[PDB]
Amino acid sequence: GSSGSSGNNELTQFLPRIVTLKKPPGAQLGFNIRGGKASQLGIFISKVIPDSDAHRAGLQEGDQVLAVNDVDFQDIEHSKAVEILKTAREISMRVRFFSGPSSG
């Protein structure tokens, strides 16, 4: 199953956002994913096509992918992360700010 929240909310602070993609007919994600081999690492926005749904969705090299379509992306293979996204008709992963206000 799948459940969400409807209405209206806008309080950016430290909450994970939802980057949903529609993906047009004849598209290909529009970005790559890095991190993940065997250890665990994480699935982050390796690269984003400068003219894709993600680029528009507001994706930025760094937006860590917590989970994708419920499935967690904390301990998953790269290919899987690539496959899932692809296979998955509709992309709906959980991302969140993974960078402080410039340490120092």
Count CB atoms within 10 A of the CB of residue 60.
13
Residue length, the chain?
A: 104
Cα-based torsion angle of the residue sequence 32, 35, 40, 42 in order, rounded to the nearest 10 degrees: -70
Residue with tokens 């989970």: 67
CA distance 3 to 59: 23
CA distance 9 to 1: 23
Superfamily of the domain at 1-104: PDZ domain (2.30.42.10)
Alpha helix segments (H runs only) across the chain: 53-57, 78-87
Give the method of determination: NMR
